[PDB]
């Protein structure tokens, strides 16, 4: 019984390690943008839209 429990736990732990290795590996892909605002109180362009 102890041997069976040990082998089952070993297999489960090995699978969990294989998963968790890549789980911790590339977890920085969550870096994205937040798109805050600044009120753009300094835009003083001219009316020359020809490019559309």
């Amino acid at each position: 019984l102890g041997t069976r429990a040990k082998e089952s736990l070993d297999l489960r732990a090995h699978l969990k390690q294989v998963k968790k290795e890549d789980i911790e590996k590339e977890n920085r892909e969550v870096g994205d943008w937040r798109k805050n605002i600044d009120a753009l109180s300094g835009m003083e362009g001219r009316k020359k839209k020809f490019e559309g």
Binding site: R34, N36, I37, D38, A39, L40, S41
Partner: protein, 51 residues
């Protein structure tokens, strides 16, 4: 000319009325600038609470 005189007077009055609207538009510009700044600040705090 008399009619040109009345026309120039009316046009200068129209200029002055446009200046009164210039004042009102200035007030709109200033208050909306306050709104812009307040929105910048509130958006910053909302994003922080999101974090």
């Amino acid at each position: 000319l008399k009619d040109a005189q009345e026309k120039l007077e009316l046009a200068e009055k129209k200029a002055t009325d446009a200046e009164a609207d210039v004042a009102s538009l200035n007030r709109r510009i200033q208050l909306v600038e306050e709104e812009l700044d307040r929105a910048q600040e509130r958006l910053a705090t909302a994003l922080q609470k999101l974090e």
